[model samples]
Target: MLPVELVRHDVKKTDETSQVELMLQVDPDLFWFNGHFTGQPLLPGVAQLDWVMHYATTVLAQGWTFLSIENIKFQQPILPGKTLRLVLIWHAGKQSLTFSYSILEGDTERTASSGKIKLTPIME
Candidate 1:
Protein backbone atom coordinates (compact mmCIF):
# COMPACT_ATOMS: atom_id res chain seq x y z
CA MET A 1 0.00 0.00 0.00
CA LEU A 2 1.29 3.45 -0.96
CA PRO A 3 0.87 6.51 1.19
CA VAL A 4 -1.17 9.38 -0.16
CA GLU A 5 -0.20 12.96 0.59
CA LEU A 6 -2.75 15.48 1.68
CA VAL A 7 -1.55 18.89 0.71
CA ARG A 8 -4.37 20.68 2.50
CA HIS A 9 -8.10 20.56 3.09
CA ASP A 10 -11.22 22.62 3.67
CA VAL A 11 -14.12 21.16 5.59
CA LYS A 12 -17.66 22.20 6.38
CA LYS A 13 -20.08 20.50 8.69
CA THR A 14 -23.59 21.40 9.78
CA ASP A 15 -26.91 19.78 10.46
CA GLU A 16 -27.73 20.15 6.82
CA THR A 17 -24.32 19.65 5.27
CA SER A 18 -21.20 17.52 5.64
CA GLN A 19 -18.53 18.18 3.07
CA VAL A 20 -14.76 18.02 2.72
CA GLU A 21 -12.54 19.25 -0.05
CA LEU A 22 -8.99 17.98 -0.13
CA MET A 23 -5.93 19.02 -2.08
CA LEU A 24 -3.74 15.99 -2.69
CA GLN A 25 -0.64 14.88 -4.56
CA VAL A 26 0.60 11.37 -5.27
CA ASP A 27 4.30 10.55 -5.20
CA PRO A 28 5.89 8.57 -7.98
CA ASP A 29 7.45 6.23 -5.48
CA LEU A 30 4.07 5.16 -4.17
CA PHE A 31 3.78 1.38 -4.11
CA TRP A 32 0.42 1.38 -5.90
CA PHE A 33 2.13 2.51 -9.09
CA ASN A 34 4.53 -0.40 -9.11
CA GLY A 35 3.80 -2.93 -11.89
CA HIS A 36 0.92 -0.73 -13.09
CA PHE A 37 2.81 -0.16 -16.31
CA THR A 38 6.38 -0.28 -17.54
CA GLY A 39 6.64 3.22 -18.98
CA GLN A 40 3.77 4.95 -17.19
CA PRO A 41 2.85 4.61 -13.57
CA LEU A 42 -0.79 5.43 -12.95
CA LEU A 43 -2.95 5.53 -9.87
CA PRO A 44 -5.43 2.68 -9.81
CA GLY A 45 -9.19 2.92 -9.31
CA VAL A 46 -9.12 0.70 -6.21
CA ALA A 47 -6.63 3.05 -4.58
CA GLN A 48 -8.92 5.96 -5.25
CA LEU A 49 -11.80 4.29 -3.41
CA ASP A 50 -9.50 3.42 -0.58
CA TRP A 51 -8.75 7.10 -0.22
CA VAL A 52 -12.46 7.86 0.03
CA MET A 53 -12.98 5.47 2.92
CA HIS A 54 -9.81 6.68 4.62
CA TYR A 55 -10.65 10.35 4.53
CA ALA A 56 -14.24 9.69 5.51
CA THR A 57 -13.11 7.97 8.65
CA THR A 58 -10.56 10.62 9.50
CA VAL A 59 -12.61 13.73 8.72
CA LEU A 60 -16.17 12.80 9.53
CA ALA A 61 -17.62 12.46 12.99
CA GLN A 62 -19.40 9.16 12.40
CA GLY A 63 -16.90 7.09 10.50
CA TRP A 64 -18.31 4.29 8.38
CA THR A 65 -17.36 0.92 6.96
CA PHE A 66 -17.64 -0.06 3.31
CA LEU A 67 -21.02 -1.62 2.56
CA SER A 68 -20.91 -1.22 -1.20
CA ILE A 69 -20.40 1.26 -4.05
CA GLU A 70 -22.38 2.57 -7.00
CA ASN A 71 -21.93 4.58 -10.21
CA ILE A 72 -18.14 4.49 -10.09
CA LYS A 73 -16.33 5.82 -13.14
CA PHE A 74 -12.65 6.31 -13.85
CA GLN A 75 -12.45 9.02 -16.45
CA GLN A 76 -8.75 9.79 -16.56
CA PRO A 77 -5.38 8.52 -15.48
CA ILE A 78 -3.80 10.21 -12.48
CA LEU A 79 -0.10 10.83 -12.87
CA PRO A 80 2.46 11.56 -10.19
CA GLY A 81 3.73 15.09 -9.46
CA LYS A 82 0.36 16.70 -10.30
CA THR A 83 -1.92 18.27 -7.79
CA LEU A 84 -5.50 17.01 -7.60
CA ARG A 85 -8.59 17.82 -5.62
CA LEU A 86 -10.88 15.32 -3.87
CA VAL A 87 -14.37 16.23 -2.83
CA LEU A 88 -16.45 14.18 -0.41
CA ILE A 89 -20.00 14.72 0.80
CA TRP A 90 -21.74 12.62 3.39
CA HIS A 91 -25.46 12.06 3.78
CA ALA A 92 -26.24 10.94 7.25
CA GLY A 93 -29.82 9.87 6.88
CA LYS A 94 -29.16 8.06 3.63
CA GLN A 95 -26.07 6.47 5.07
CA SER A 96 -24.17 7.22 1.91
CA LEU A 97 -21.14 9.13 0.70
CA THR A 98 -20.28 10.67 -2.63
CA PHE A 99 -16.75 11.39 -3.83
CA SER A 100 -15.04 12.95 -6.80
CA TYR A 101 -11.48 13.57 -7.97
CA SER A 102 -10.49 16.32 -10.33
CA ILE A 103 -7.59 18.36 -11.64
CA LEU A 104 -7.41 21.91 -12.89
CA GLU A 105 -7.34 22.41 -16.66
CA GLY A 106 -6.47 26.03 -17.38
CA ASP A 107 -9.36 27.67 -15.48
CA THR A 108 -11.68 24.68 -15.47
CA GLU A 109 -11.51 21.42 -13.58
CA ARG A 110 -11.55 18.01 -15.23
CA THR A 111 -12.90 15.06 -13.30
CA ALA A 112 -10.60 12.08 -13.01
CA SER A 113 -13.08 9.79 -11.27
CA SER A 114 -16.34 9.78 -9.29
CA GLY A 115 -18.54 7.37 -7.34
CA LYS A 116 -21.04 6.88 -4.55
CA ILE A 117 -20.41 4.67 -1.56
CA LYS A 118 -23.12 3.13 0.54
CA LEU A 119 -22.26 2.97 4.20
CA THR A 120 -25.28 1.31 5.74
CA PRO A 121 -26.27 -2.20 4.89
CA ILE A 122 -29.80 -3.29 4.18
CA MET A 123 -31.44 -5.16 7.03
CA GLU A 124 -32.12 -8.80 6.26
Candidate 2:
Protein backbone atom coordinates (compact mmCIF):
# COMPACT_ATOMS: atom_id res chain seq x y z
CA MET A 1 0.00 0.00 0.00
CA LEU A 2 1.10 3.55 -0.62
CA PRO A 3 2.25 5.54 2.40
CA VAL A 4 0.81 9.00 1.93
CA GLU A 5 -2.24 10.40 0.16
CA LEU A 6 -1.57 12.38 -2.99
CA VAL A 7 -4.04 15.20 -2.83
CA ARG A 8 -3.07 16.87 -6.13
CA HIS A 9 -0.23 17.63 -8.52
CA ASP A 10 0.94 20.10 -11.12
CA VAL A 11 3.43 19.19 -13.83
CA LYS A 12 5.37 21.92 -15.52
CA LYS A 13 8.23 22.31 -17.96
CA THR A 14 10.22 25.21 -19.27
CA ASP A 15 13.40 25.93 -21.15
CA GLU A 16 15.34 25.95 -17.92
CA THR A 17 13.64 23.28 -15.84
CA SER A 18 11.36 20.26 -15.80
CA GLN A 19 9.50 19.45 -12.65
CA VAL A 20 6.28 18.65 -10.85
CA GLU A 21 4.67 20.09 -7.78
CA LEU A 22 2.77 17.68 -5.58
CA MET A 23 0.37 18.36 -2.75
CA LEU A 24 0.44 15.51 -0.28
CA GLN A 25 -1.59 14.77 2.78
CA VAL A 26 0.00 12.88 5.63
CA ASP A 27 -3.04 10.97 6.76
CA PRO A 28 -3.33 10.35 10.44
CA ASP A 29 -4.18 6.71 9.82
CA LEU A 30 -1.43 5.96 7.34
CA PHE A 31 0.10 2.52 7.51
CA TRP A 32 3.60 3.80 8.27
CA PHE A 33 2.44 5.72 11.30
CA ASN A 34 1.26 2.61 13.05
CA GLY A 35 3.35 1.58 16.08
CA HIS A 36 6.08 3.98 15.07
CA PHE A 37 6.35 5.59 18.47
CA THR A 38 3.22 4.58 20.39
CA GLY A 39 2.60 8.06 21.75
CA GLN A 40 3.96 10.26 18.92
CA PRO A 41 4.01 8.44 15.62
CA LEU A 42 6.23 10.09 13.06
CA LEU A 43 6.69 9.38 9.37
CA PRO A 44 9.97 7.64 8.82
CA GLY A 45 12.53 9.09 6.43
CA VAL A 46 12.59 5.91 4.37
CA ALA A 47 8.88 6.24 3.76
CA GLN A 48 9.50 9.66 2.31
CA LEU A 49 12.13 8.23 -0.01
CA ASP A 50 9.76 5.55 -1.19
CA TRP A 51 7.12 8.10 -2.02
CA VAL A 52 9.71 10.13 -3.88
CA MET A 53 10.67 7.21 -6.11
CA HIS A 54 7.04 6.30 -6.60
CA TYR A 55 6.12 9.71 -7.90
CA ALA A 56 9.35 10.29 -9.75
CA THR A 57 8.82 7.19 -11.81
CA THR A 58 5.15 7.83 -12.43
CA VAL A 59 5.50 11.51 -13.28
CA LEU A 60 9.00 12.34 -14.44
CA ALA A 61 10.99 9.30 -15.55
CA GLN A 62 8.60 6.71 -16.96
CA GLY A 63 11.04 3.81 -17.27
CA TRP A 64 13.88 4.99 -15.09
CA THR A 65 15.22 3.22 -12.02
CA PHE A 66 16.84 4.72 -8.99
CA LEU A 67 20.61 4.42 -9.25
CA SER A 68 21.77 6.10 -6.07
CA ILE A 69 20.87 8.83 -3.69
CA GLU A 70 23.31 11.64 -4.34
CA ASN A 71 22.36 13.49 -1.19
CA ILE A 72 19.38 13.98 1.13
CA LYS A 73 18.66 15.42 4.54
CA PHE A 74 15.77 15.67 6.98
CA GLN A 75 15.45 18.91 8.79
CA GLN A 76 12.27 18.45 10.84
CA PRO A 77 10.01 15.75 12.16
CA ILE A 78 7.01 15.04 9.97
CA LEU A 79 4.11 14.44 12.27
CA PRO A 80 0.76 12.96 11.38
CA GLY A 81 -1.93 15.01 9.66
CA LYS A 82 0.40 17.44 7.97
CA THR A 83 -0.29 18.91 4.53
CA LEU A 84 2.95 19.10 2.61
CA ARG A 85 4.02 20.54 -0.70
CA LEU A 86 6.61 18.47 -2.54
CA VAL A 87 8.59 19.60 -5.54
CA LEU A 88 10.56 17.31 -7.82
CA ILE A 89 12.98 18.68 -10.36
CA TRP A 90 14.15 16.48 -13.20
CA HIS A 91 17.54 17.32 -14.58
CA ALA A 92 17.49 15.44 -17.85
CA GLY A 93 21.03 16.31 -18.79
CA LYS A 94 22.42 15.24 -15.45
CA GLN A 95 20.20 12.15 -15.19
CA SER A 96 19.17 13.19 -11.72
CA LEU A 97 16.21 14.40 -9.75
CA THR A 98 16.09 16.83 -6.87
CA PHE A 99 13.22 16.71 -4.40
CA SER A 100 12.21 19.26 -1.81
CA TYR A 101 9.40 19.36 0.69
CA SER A 102 7.95 22.35 2.46
CA ILE A 103 5.14 23.11 4.87
CA LEU A 104 3.23 26.34 4.81
CA GLU A 105 2.59 28.16 8.07
CA GLY A 106 0.42 31.27 7.76
CA ASP A 107 2.14 33.07 4.88
CA THR A 108 5.58 31.60 5.26
CA GLU A 109 6.90 28.25 4.12
CA ARG A 110 9.31 26.10 6.06
CA THR A 111 11.57 23.63 4.28
CA ALA A 112 11.06 20.20 5.79
CA SER A 113 13.60 18.27 3.74
CA SER A 114 15.45 18.04 0.44
CA GLY A 115 17.64 15.66 -1.54
CA LYS A 116 19.03 14.71 -4.92
CA ILE A 117 18.83 11.30 -6.55
CA LYS A 118 20.46 9.72 -9.58
CA LEU A 119 18.38 7.69 -12.07
CA THR A 120 19.17 5.42 -14.96
CA PRO A 121 16.71 4.66 -17.72
CA ILE A 122 15.88 1.18 -18.99
CA MET A 123 14.91 0.42 -22.54
CA GLU A 124 13.05 -2.58 -23.79
Candidate 3:
Protein backbone atom coordinates (compact mmCIF):
# COMPACT_ATOMS: atom_id res chain seq x y z
CA MET A 1 0.00 0.00 0.00
CA LEU A 2 1.26 3.47 -0.91
CA PRO A 3 1.52 6.11 1.74
CA VAL A 4 0.12 8.76 -0.60
CA GLU A 5 -2.56 8.65 -3.26
CA LEU A 6 -1.90 10.32 -6.60
CA VAL A 7 -4.71 11.84 -8.59
CA ARG A 8 -3.68 11.28 -12.20
CA HIS A 9 -4.76 13.58 -15.01
CA ASP A 10 -3.82 14.88 -18.45
CA VAL A 11 -2.73 11.48 -19.74
CA LYS A 12 -1.59 11.41 -23.38
CA LYS A 13 -0.47 8.39 -25.38
CA THR A 14 1.03 7.56 -28.73
CA ASP A 15 1.85 4.41 -30.67
CA GLU A 16 5.57 4.42 -29.94
CA THR A 17 5.47 6.39 -26.70
CA SER A 18 3.14 7.52 -23.92
CA GLN A 19 3.11 10.60 -21.77
CA VAL A 20 1.34 11.14 -18.52
CA GLU A 21 1.12 14.18 -16.34
CA LEU A 22 -0.12 13.42 -12.86
CA MET A 23 -1.10 15.67 -10.00
CA LEU A 24 -0.65 14.72 -6.39
CA GLN A 25 -1.77 16.93 -3.55
CA VAL A 26 0.05 15.48 -0.59
CA ASP A 27 -2.44 14.76 2.14
CA PRO A 28 -1.31 16.60 5.21
CA ASP A 29 -3.31 14.24 7.34
CA LEU A 30 -1.19 11.23 6.44
CA PHE A 31 0.82 9.47 9.14
CA TRP A 32 4.15 9.79 7.32
CA PHE A 33 4.63 13.38 8.34
CA ASN A 34 4.18 12.57 11.98
CA GLY A 35 7.44 10.68 12.35
CA HIS A 36 9.17 11.84 9.14
CA PHE A 37 10.39 14.87 11.02
CA THR A 38 9.41 16.98 13.96
CA GLY A 39 8.89 20.48 12.53
CA GLN A 40 9.95 20.00 8.89
CA PRO A 41 8.43 17.27 6.73
CA LEU A 42 10.02 16.72 3.37
CA LEU A 43 9.02 14.05 0.94
CA PRO A 44 11.51 11.21 0.97
CA GLY A 45 13.23 10.19 -2.28
CA VAL A 46 12.41 6.52 -1.76
CA ALA A 47 8.77 7.43 -1.41
CA GLN A 48 8.96 9.17 -4.73
CA LEU A 49 10.22 6.00 -6.44
CA ASP A 50 7.51 3.94 -4.82
CA TRP A 51 4.85 6.32 -6.06
CA VAL A 52 6.26 6.17 -9.56
CA MET A 53 6.23 2.40 -9.63
CA HIS A 54 2.66 2.28 -8.44
CA TYR A 55 1.58 4.79 -11.04
CA ALA A 56 3.36 2.94 -13.82
CA THR A 57 1.68 -0.35 -13.03
CA THR A 58 -1.80 0.86 -12.17
CA VAL A 59 -2.10 3.62 -14.76
CA LEU A 60 0.15 2.36 -17.56
CA ALA A 61 -0.14 -1.37 -17.08
CA GLN A 62 3.60 -1.65 -16.93
CA GLY A 63 5.83 -3.39 -14.42
CA TRP A 64 9.33 -2.07 -13.98
CA THR A 65 12.32 -1.94 -11.69
CA PHE A 66 14.81 0.73 -10.75
CA LEU A 67 17.75 -0.03 -13.03
CA SER A 68 19.77 3.10 -12.52
CA ILE A 69 19.43 6.63 -11.15
CA GLU A 70 21.64 9.49 -12.16
CA ASN A 71 21.76 13.26 -12.11
CA ILE A 72 19.30 13.47 -9.27
CA LYS A 73 19.21 16.82 -7.55
CA PHE A 74 16.40 17.75 -5.21
CA GLN A 75 16.49 21.51 -5.34
CA GLN A 76 13.34 22.29 -3.39
CA PRO A 77 11.69 20.36 -0.65
CA ILE A 78 8.14 19.07 -0.99
CA LEU A 79 5.95 20.27 1.83
CA PRO A 80 2.98 18.46 3.24
CA GLY A 81 0.41 20.82 1.76
CA LYS A 82 2.06 21.34 -1.61
CA THR A 83 1.00 19.72 -4.85
CA LEU A 84 3.41 18.11 -7.30
CA ARG A 85 3.22 17.67 -11.05
CA LEU A 86 4.81 14.46 -12.26
CA VAL A 87 5.53 14.02 -15.93
CA LEU A 88 6.49 10.65 -17.43
CA ILE A 89 7.35 9.62 -20.99
CA TRP A 90 7.85 6.01 -21.96
CA HIS A 91 8.87 3.93 -24.92
CA ALA A 92 7.24 0.56 -25.17
CA GLY A 93 9.77 -1.38 -27.22
CA LYS A 94 12.78 0.18 -25.61
CA GLN A 95 11.41 -0.61 -22.20
CA SER A 96 12.59 2.68 -20.83
CA LEU A 97 11.27 6.13 -20.02
CA THR A 98 12.50 9.56 -19.11
CA PHE A 99 10.81 11.19 -16.16
CA SER A 100 10.74 14.77 -15.01
CA TYR A 101 8.85 16.63 -12.34
CA SER A 102 7.83 20.11 -11.25
CA ILE A 103 5.92 21.45 -8.32
CA LEU A 104 2.75 23.38 -9.05
CA GLU A 105 3.40 25.64 -6.12
CA GLY A 106 5.80 28.60 -6.08
CA ASP A 107 8.80 26.29 -6.21
CA THR A 108 11.19 27.10 -9.07
CA GLU A 109 11.81 23.44 -9.91
CA ARG A 110 15.42 24.34 -10.44
CA THR A 111 16.52 20.89 -9.35
CA ALA A 112 16.12 18.07 -11.87
CA SER A 113 15.99 14.28 -11.54
CA SER A 114 16.12 12.10 -14.66
CA GLY A 115 16.67 8.40 -15.17
CA LYS A 116 15.51 5.33 -17.03
CA ILE A 117 13.06 2.65 -15.89
CA LYS A 118 13.34 -0.92 -17.16
CA LEU A 119 9.98 -2.56 -17.62
CA THR A 120 9.04 -6.18 -18.10
CA PRO A 121 5.65 -6.14 -19.75
CA ILE A 122 3.01 -8.64 -18.77
CA MET A 123 2.70 -11.15 -21.57
CA GLU A 124 -0.90 -12.02 -22.17
Candidate 4:
Protein backbone atom coordinates (compact mmCIF):
# COMPACT_ATOMS: atom_id res chain seq x y z
CA MET A 1 0.00 0.00 0.00
CA LEU A 2 1.22 3.50 -0.86
CA PRO A 3 1.02 6.23 1.72
CA VAL A 4 -0.91 9.26 0.62
CA GLU A 5 0.93 11.53 3.00
CA LEU A 6 4.29 10.64 1.52
CA VAL A 7 3.50 11.40 -2.09
CA ARG A 8 2.30 14.37 -4.14
CA HIS A 9 1.56 14.01 -7.83
CA ASP A 10 1.15 16.35 -10.76
CA VAL A 11 -0.36 15.27 -14.04
CA LYS A 12 0.30 16.90 -17.39
CA LYS A 13 -2.48 15.64 -19.58
CA THR A 14 -4.17 17.33 -22.47
CA ASP A 15 -7.29 15.46 -23.39
CA GLU A 16 -6.48 11.72 -23.76
CA THR A 17 -2.71 12.04 -23.36
CA SER A 18 -0.97 11.25 -20.09
CA GLN A 19 2.27 12.44 -18.58
CA VAL A 20 2.55 12.32 -14.80
CA GLU A 21 5.23 13.01 -12.29
CA LEU A 22 5.21 12.28 -8.58
CA MET A 23 7.32 13.79 -5.86
CA LEU A 24 7.59 11.70 -2.76
CA GLN A 25 9.63 11.30 0.37
CA VAL A 26 10.51 7.97 1.78
CA ASP A 27 9.79 8.02 5.49
CA PRO A 28 11.72 5.87 7.89
CA ASP A 29 8.47 4.81 9.45
CA LEU A 30 7.14 3.40 6.21
CA PHE A 31 5.66 -0.06 6.84
CA TRP A 32 7.78 -1.77 4.22
CA PHE A 33 10.95 -0.64 5.91
CA ASN A 34 10.48 -2.92 8.85
CA GLY A 35 12.49 -6.16 8.58
CA HIS A 36 13.67 -5.33 5.06
CA PHE A 37 17.12 -5.15 6.62
CA THR A 38 18.51 -4.86 10.15
CA GLY A 39 19.70 -1.24 10.38
CA GLN A 40 20.04 -0.28 6.74
CA PRO A 41 16.61 -0.49 5.26
CA LEU A 42 16.03 0.03 1.60
CA LEU A 43 13.00 0.16 -0.63
CA PRO A 44 12.46 -3.18 -2.33
CA GLY A 45 12.39 -3.39 -6.12
CA VAL A 46 9.10 -5.26 -6.04
CA ALA A 47 7.55 -2.45 -4.06
CA GLN A 48 8.66 0.04 -6.65
CA LEU A 49 7.09 -1.93 -9.48
CA ASP A 50 3.89 -2.27 -7.49
CA TRP A 51 3.69 1.48 -7.13
CA VAL A 52 4.23 1.98 -10.87
CA MET A 53 1.21 -0.13 -11.65
CA HIS A 54 -0.79 1.38 -8.83
CA TYR A 55 -0.28 4.94 -9.95
CA ALA A 56 -0.70 3.98 -13.57
CA THR A 57 -4.13 2.50 -12.93
CA THR A 58 -5.27 5.04 -10.38
CA VAL A 59 -4.15 8.28 -12.01
CA LEU A 60 -2.65 7.72 -15.45
CA ALA A 61 -4.46 5.05 -17.46
CA GLN A 62 -7.71 3.79 -16.04
CA GLY A 63 -8.30 0.46 -17.73
CA TRP A 64 -4.83 -0.70 -18.75
CA THR A 65 -3.67 -4.04 -17.44
CA PHE A 66 0.03 -4.46 -16.68
CA LEU A 67 1.58 -7.03 -18.98
CA SER A 68 5.35 -7.10 -18.55
CA ILE A 69 8.39 -5.00 -17.78
CA GLU A 70 11.68 -4.59 -19.65
CA ASN A 71 15.06 -2.98 -19.13
CA ILE A 72 14.59 -2.27 -15.44
CA LYS A 73 17.65 -1.06 -13.59
CA PHE A 74 18.08 -0.14 -9.93
CA GLN A 75 21.13 2.05 -9.70
CA GLN A 76 21.17 3.13 -6.08
CA PRO A 77 19.63 2.46 -2.74
CA ILE A 78 16.58 4.52 -1.88
CA LEU A 79 17.20 5.55 1.69
CA PRO A 80 14.63 6.91 4.07
CA GLY A 81 13.97 10.65 4.15
CA LYS A 82 15.22 11.17 0.63
CA THR A 83 12.99 12.95 -1.88
CA LEU A 84 12.64 11.45 -5.33
CA ARG A 85 10.61 11.89 -8.43
CA LEU A 86 8.70 9.24 -10.34
CA VAL A 87 8.00 10.13 -13.94
CA LEU A 88 5.45 8.35 -16.09
CA ILE A 89 4.72 8.62 -19.77
CA TRP A 90 1.93 6.70 -21.42
CA HIS A 91 2.27 5.72 -25.07
CA ALA A 92 -1.07 5.02 -26.64
CA GLY A 93 0.23 3.61 -29.91
CA LYS A 94 2.55 1.02 -28.38
CA GLN A 95 0.32 0.33 -25.38
CA SER A 96 3.28 0.93 -23.12
CA LEU A 97 4.34 3.16 -20.25
CA THR A 98 7.84 4.40 -19.61
CA PHE A 99 8.73 5.12 -16.02
CA SER A 100 11.74 6.69 -14.38
CA TYR A 101 12.62 7.12 -10.72
CA SER A 102 15.16 9.82 -10.17
CA ILE A 103 16.64 12.31 -7.76
CA LEU A 104 16.51 15.97 -8.60
CA GLU A 105 19.77 17.78 -8.06
CA GLY A 106 20.09 21.34 -9.23
CA ASP A 107 19.05 21.17 -12.89
CA THR A 108 19.49 17.49 -13.50
CA GLU A 109 17.59 14.37 -12.64
CA ARG A 110 19.90 11.52 -11.71
CA THR A 111 18.07 8.34 -12.53
CA ALA A 112 17.89 5.61 -9.92
CA SER A 113 15.81 3.20 -11.94
CA SER A 114 14.00 3.22 -15.26
CA GLY A 115 11.95 0.78 -17.29
CA LYS A 116 9.15 0.26 -19.73
CA ILE A 117 5.90 -1.50 -19.05
CA LYS A 118 3.58 -3.02 -21.58
CA LEU A 119 -0.13 -3.09 -20.88
CA THR A 120 -3.27 -4.30 -22.54
CA PRO A 121 -7.00 -4.50 -21.94
CA ILE A 122 -8.42 -7.39 -19.94
CA MET A 123 -9.90 -9.26 -22.86
CA GLU A 124 -7.22 -8.31 -25.31
Error of 3 at 45 (Å): 0.5
Each candidate's lDDT (Cα)? 0.78, 0.82, 0.65, 0.78
Cα RMSDs, all models: 3.0, 2.2, 3.4, 2.7
Q: What is candidate 1's lDDT per residue for 7-124, written digit by digit as tens? A: 6466787775589988887777778666655467778888888988888867863546788886799998888665788989888778778899997656878899999888864241
Q: Backbone clash tally for model 3?
A: 0
My TM-score estimates for the predictions, one after another, are: 0.82, 0.86, 0.72, 0.81
lDDT of 3: 0.65
lDDT of predicted model 1: 0.78
TM-score of 3: 0.72
- Per-residue lDDT of candidate 2, residues 18-102 (tens digit): 7888888788887777775466787788888988999989988888888899999999877888878889998878988999988
How displaced is residue 88 in candidate 3, in Å?
Answer: 1.3
Cα-lDDT of candidate 2: 0.82
Query: Model 4, clash count?
Result: 0
Which one wins by TM-score: 2 or 3?
A: 2
Candidate 4 on 6-94: residue-level lDDT in tens? 55567787655588888877777787777655567877888789888888887877877888886688997777666789888887677
RMSD of 3: 3.4
- Candidate 2 Cα deviation (angstroms), residue 33: 1.2
